[PDB]
Ligand binder design. Structure first.
Ligand SMILES: O=S1(=O)Nc2ccccc2-c2ccccc21
Length: 156
């Protein structure tokens, strides 16, 4: 898709020029070695001063041919413990749904900052996985203990 590839080239240019510290966002490669702008490997650092601090959380960003009509699918690999992350790793976030709060103008930087914000502030109205949601509601101290252990597990 010329439209998608043009925009994704723009996003790549913008990202490389200016991005939040500690974040990674890089296109992958096709089997013939050429750049695949439709599939990006990303990393989100835990925010300092939070239970997520010290962790670096890898995710994949997958674009459809009609991007930016549609949002990318954003998938933590491996899946994370968090009330709004499905067991598959897919992130549940309103800006990542075409029929909700997605806008074509939203940038890869805004997506990754939006997901970082989600990590530290779950949306209890949108549970995506039973376990983390249940613990978040029943015992916040236990919830943070689990989050800190996970952050240590994914320390770079
Ligand atoms: O090469 S990866 O360890 N491997 C990897 C696999 C899926 C998604 C992201 C990543 C990633 C992201 C940032 C830095 C490094 C990696």
């Amino acid at each position: 898709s010329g439209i998608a590839l043009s925009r994704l080239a723009q996003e790549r240019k913008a990202w490389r020029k200016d991005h939040p510290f500690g974040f990674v966002a890089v296109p992958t490669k096709n089997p013939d070695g050429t750049m695949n702008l439709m599939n990006w490997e990303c990393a989100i650092p835990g925010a300092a001063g939070t239970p997520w601090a010290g962790g670096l959380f890898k995710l994949r960003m997958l674009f459809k041919d009609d991007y930016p009509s549609s949002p990318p699918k954003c998938k933590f690999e491996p899946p994370l413990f968090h009330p709004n992350v499905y067991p598959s790793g897919t992130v549940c976030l309103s800006i990542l749904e075409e029929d909700k709060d997605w806008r074509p103008a939203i940038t890869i930087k805004q997506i990754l900052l939006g997901i970082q914000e989600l990590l530290n502030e779950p949306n209890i109205q949108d549970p995506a996985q039973a376990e983390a949601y249940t613990i978040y509601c029943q015992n916040r101290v236990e919830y943070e203990k689990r989050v800190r252990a996970q952050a240590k597990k994914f320390a770079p």
